Design an enzyme around this catalytic site. Structure first.
Site, PDB file in Angstrom:
ATOM      1  N   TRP B 121      35.118  25.346  39.715  1.00  0.00           N
ATOM      2  CA  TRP B 121      35.786  25.610  40.946  1.00  0.00           C
ATOM      3  C   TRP B 121      35.155  24.704  42.004  1.00  0.00           C
ATOM      4  O   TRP B 121      33.950  24.822  42.280  1.00  0.00           O
ATOM      5  CB  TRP B 121      35.620  27.093  41.264  1.00  0.00           C
ATOM      6  CG  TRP B 121      36.276  27.569  42.512  1.00  0.00           C
ATOM      7  CD1 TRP B 121      37.589  27.674  42.753  1.00  0.00           C
ATOM      8  CD2 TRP B 121      35.598  28.062  43.668  1.00  0.00           C
ATOM      9  NE1 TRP B 121      37.792  28.198  44.002  1.00  0.00           N
ATOM     10  CE2 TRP B 121      36.574  28.419  44.596  1.00  0.00           C
ATOM     11  CE3 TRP B 121      34.239  28.191  44.015  1.00  0.00           C
ATOM     12  CZ2 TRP B 121      36.254  28.946  45.846  1.00  0.00           C
ATOM     13  CZ3 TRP B 121      33.920  28.685  45.255  1.00  0.00           C
ATOM     14  CH2 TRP B 121      34.921  29.074  46.150  1.00  0.00           C
ATOM     15  N   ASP B 203      29.717  34.218  38.997  1.00  0.00           N
ATOM     16  CA  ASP B 203      30.851  34.171  39.899  1.00  0.00           C
ATOM     17  C   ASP B 203      31.983  34.884  39.196  1.00  0.00           C
ATOM     18  O   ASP B 203      32.537  34.355  38.234  1.00  0.00           O
ATOM     19  CB  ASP B 203      31.229  32.729  40.201  1.00  0.00           C
ATOM     20  CG  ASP B 203      32.344  32.599  41.229  1.00  0.00           C
ATOM     21  OD1 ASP B 203      32.954  33.623  41.629  1.00  0.00           O
ATOM     22  OD2 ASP B 203      32.661  31.434  41.588  1.00  0.00           O
ATOM     23  N   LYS B 239      41.778  37.775  44.079  1.00  0.00           N
ATOM     24  CA  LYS B 239      42.682  37.398  42.983  1.00  0.00           C
ATOM     25  C   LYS B 239      43.079  38.585  42.174  1.00  0.00           C
ATOM     26  O   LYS B 239      44.235  38.680  41.852  1.00  0.00           O
ATOM     27  CB  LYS B 239      42.019  36.325  42.131  1.00  0.00           C
ATOM     28  CG  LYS B 239      42.080  35.017  42.916  1.00  0.00           C
ATOM     29  CD  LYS B 239      40.820  34.203  42.898  1.00  0.00           C
ATOM     30  CE  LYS B 239      41.004  32.921  43.711  1.00  0.00           C
ATOM     31  NZ  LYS B 239      39.607  32.662  44.030  1.00  0.00           N
TER      32      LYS B 239
HETATM   33  C1  LIG Z   1      39.090  31.839  43.289  1.00  0.00           C
HETATM   34  C2  LIG Z   1      37.668  31.587  43.257  1.00  0.00           C
HETATM   35  C3  LIG Z   1      36.588  31.873  44.227  1.00  0.00           C
HETATM   36  C4  LIG Z   1      36.755  32.238  45.664  1.00  0.00           C
HETATM   37  O1  LIG Z   1      37.132  33.562  45.919  1.00  0.00           O
HETATM   38  P1  LIG Z   1      37.854  33.805  47.339  1.00  0.00           P
HETATM   39  O2  LIG Z   1      38.140  35.303  47.349  1.00  0.00           O
HETATM   40  O3  LIG Z   1      39.186  33.118  47.360  1.00  0.00           O
HETATM   41  O4  LIG Z   1      37.013  33.248  48.528  1.00  0.00           O
HETATM   42  C5  LIG Z   1      35.297  31.681  43.805  1.00  0.00           C
HETATM   43  N1  LIG Z   1      34.979  31.333  42.564  1.00  0.00           N
HETATM   44  C6  LIG Z   1      35.888  31.096  41.593  1.00  0.00           C
HETATM   45  C7  LIG Z   1      35.506  30.668  40.199  1.00  0.00           C
HETATM   46  C8  LIG Z   1      37.301  31.229  41.897  1.00  0.00           C
HETATM   47  O5  LIG Z   1      38.248  31.044  40.935  1.00  0.00           O
END
Ligand SMILES: *Cc1c(COP(=O)(O)O)cnc(C)c1O
Ligand SMILES: *Cc1c(COP(=O)(O)O)cnc(C)c1O
Lengths: 392, 392
Positions: B121, B203, B239
């Site tokens: 990312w 993450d 998400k």
């Molecule tokens: C989508 C994403 C993020 C960020 O999350 P947000 O809620 O949009 O700030 C961080 N890490 C990964 C791997 C992602 O896919």
């Protein structure tokens, strides 16, 4: 084994505890910590025009919603420089905009760049610089607790000692927490130092429209430095002057003396905002854009701001009037020289501790949220200050 | 000019291309944004979230504790005792990641190597650099030409890491490739962590997305936490709940010594003050309702299962189509990949040619698979078969 065995003790949050005390205190009380506003930060509820704009609102680049950025630059800089010398991006409220600017300064100059901060200041300034890993943090004298005024001789001494290239965090208007701002003449003397020592202004504008009720006049300091050719950073918040805390509306902007450097600044800022948001918060920007751009909304917002600032001046005037009538010892002129929602009442820690047993709640620094005072509460505050000054 | 030597940077690799996709004529397949809200792939709120918003209508600085508790519960389950966890709110995934980066920078060192998957990312680099982690390193992760995880290179790079190095791990639905380690691979990865005293920084932005099972998607978090090792976790709800507008996330730190939790907590609270002056309560409350209310929780889990089934069905349709056409190459990666994004396995030149058939993928073969339909998947099948057979 434990990775965190050296984590290091930190003093606990002064405000949060004291805030709950005032809130969960009986009922016959004067809460000047939070009170009418929503937190001890003083975030107000959305203003009438903001609510109209929310209703009337019924593919962004990383920098964010460009119409909002343009209006935000206009209200701040007011044609003091040409547009091509200005670069702006959205920040998540004031705090996010400060951190963008701080990270920008850390990336393009150096993390070891000294940062001068007013004594006292908005407490989270330190948290922002530390997150950016700005580790050389210094004080410039600002409030004189004995003389209840800006220690302007001290301020100029400390800034005249600043290494060239030092960052100075400047409160644009309505200094937080003192409520006391430099005069225009004092800003001129300050500007001369910045110019002679090639210091970097980092303006924090969370209250444009609160100080005097005049957006233009409240922008005097930003526009003085910009117009005279200073390069600088500005973090703008709309959390307070519009009540948009939940929508996290702000702008971090950079002033460049060379407009050909602007695309490079903009790209550097865009990778920095990526540490703050993955997609720019469009909704709050669209709301603010509408309050800023729509003539009728804009007029109604300017007017509500003008109303608030005269009201708070009225309350300050009543406070001072009550203290002169009682002959309360000390100088109280500072009460009617202060602006914005916070005032340093001029009391000692001990005097503030006794006020809180009158259920007159201020912070132990003497910070009072003076918006929300009523003719009834200001008279309780008159009697309370007069009592603690004389007996403590 | 202070900004004279500002480093030039590459242009946004998605924004322009996404515009080309959105502006192209109607018979097309937009696999960059599509029916999702933006280029990050943030969906609209799931139905249970909408129902939570509705039920809600019927602090301290770290945020809304019941949210934090349910967030930790879904992540860690039985793998670690509650007393070994410290969690605070962050502004969505990005903010939660920044808090953890700034925490590590603060309590270990800013020079601590941070390993980041190749590819990853993109904004990981920007989070780490804003925290002023200056020693950023790749670990090999995906080999685009081999269409698989380069697991020998991955393990080699981590075995080359200095002890105490930080490693950014995608907990599930690796972004942008869609290819996750198997369970056996995760254990071989953990072996290196355990042998080399590396610091996992997970993450987790897609828990429940990858496979439709919250518990199964937490495998890797829980594999590492049930070891007793110390680690960090950034959780997003943007998400898997569609709550990006509410900036819902949690950063948690695992401490082997419960007695250090108070100190860790105070440090984190200082750090969140660089990010927000008051925590984002509303989205925490919404998320908390989704997580804790039996009916909403069960409906949320059903929607996640349906979503993951739907996207597997689209991957299976693509694979089946390419197989029926005898398209050259191995296509197994299509049905092995999970989540919203896939590396389809195309060269840059094959991706460029797809754009002329108005099938819009990024030149890095990344496609948002989740917006695919029976209609659109059949166009992708033929576009892929075309550019594979006719380019280079
Ligand atoms: C989508 C994403 C993020 C960020 O999350 P947000 O809620 O949009 O700030 C961080 N890490 C990964 C791997 C992602 O896919
Ligand atoms: C309120 C305030 C901020 C931060 O603004 P937020 O919008 O709440 O994030 C920054 N600086 C000063 C001086 C403030 O008064």
């Amino acid at each position: 084994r434990c990775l965190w065995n050296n984590i290091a003790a930190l003093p606990a949050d002064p405000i949060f505890s004291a805030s709950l005390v005032a809130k969960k205190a009986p009922e016959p009380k004067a809460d000047l910590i939070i009170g009418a506003y929503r937190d001890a930060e003083g975030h107000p509820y959305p203003l009438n025009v903001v609510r109209k704009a929310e209703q009337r609102l019924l593919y962004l680049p990383m920098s964010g919603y460009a119409p909002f950025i343009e209006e935000s630059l206009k209200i701040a800089y007011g044609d003091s420089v040409a547009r091509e010398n200005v670069v702006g991006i959205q920040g998540l409220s004031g705090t996010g905009s400060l951190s963008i600017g701080a990270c920008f300064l850390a990336r393009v100059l150096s993390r070891d760049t000294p940062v001068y901060i007013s004594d006292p200041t908005w407490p989270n300034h330190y948290a922002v610089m530390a997150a950016a890993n700005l580790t050389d943090l210094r004080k410039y004298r600002y409030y004189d607790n004995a003389k209840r005024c800006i220690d302007f001789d001290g301020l100029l001494e400390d800034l005249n000692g600043a290494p060239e290239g030092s960052i100075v965090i400047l409160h644009a208007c309505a200094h937080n927490p003192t409520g006391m701002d430099p005069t225009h003449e004092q800003w001129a003397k300050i500007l001369e130092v910045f110019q002679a020592r090639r210091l970097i202004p980092f303006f924090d504008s969370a209250y444009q429209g609160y100080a005097t009720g005049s957006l233009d006049n409240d922008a005097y300091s930003i526009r003085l430095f910009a117009r005279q050719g200073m390069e600088m950073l500005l973090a703008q918040s709309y959390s307070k002057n519009m009540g948009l805390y939940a929508e996290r509306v702000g702008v971090c902007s950079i002033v460049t003396a060379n407009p050909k450097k602007a695309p490079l600044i903009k790209s550097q800022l865009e990778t920095i905002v990526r540490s703050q948001y993955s997609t720019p918060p469009a909704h709050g920007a669209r709301v603010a854009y509408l309050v800023l751009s729509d003539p009728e909304l804009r007029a109604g917002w300017e007017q509500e701001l003008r109303v608030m600032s005269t009201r708070v001046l009225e309350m300050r005037q009543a406070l001072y009037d009550g203290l002169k009538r009682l002959g309360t010892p000390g100088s109280w002129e500072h009460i009617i020289q202060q602006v914005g929602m916070f005032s340093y009442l001029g009391l000692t820690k001990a005097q503030c501790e006794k006020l809180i047993e009158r259920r007159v709640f201020v912070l132990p620094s003497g910070r009072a949220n003076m918006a929300g005072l009523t003719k009834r509460s200001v008279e309780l505050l008159v009697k309370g200050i007069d009592e603690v000054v004389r007996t403590v």
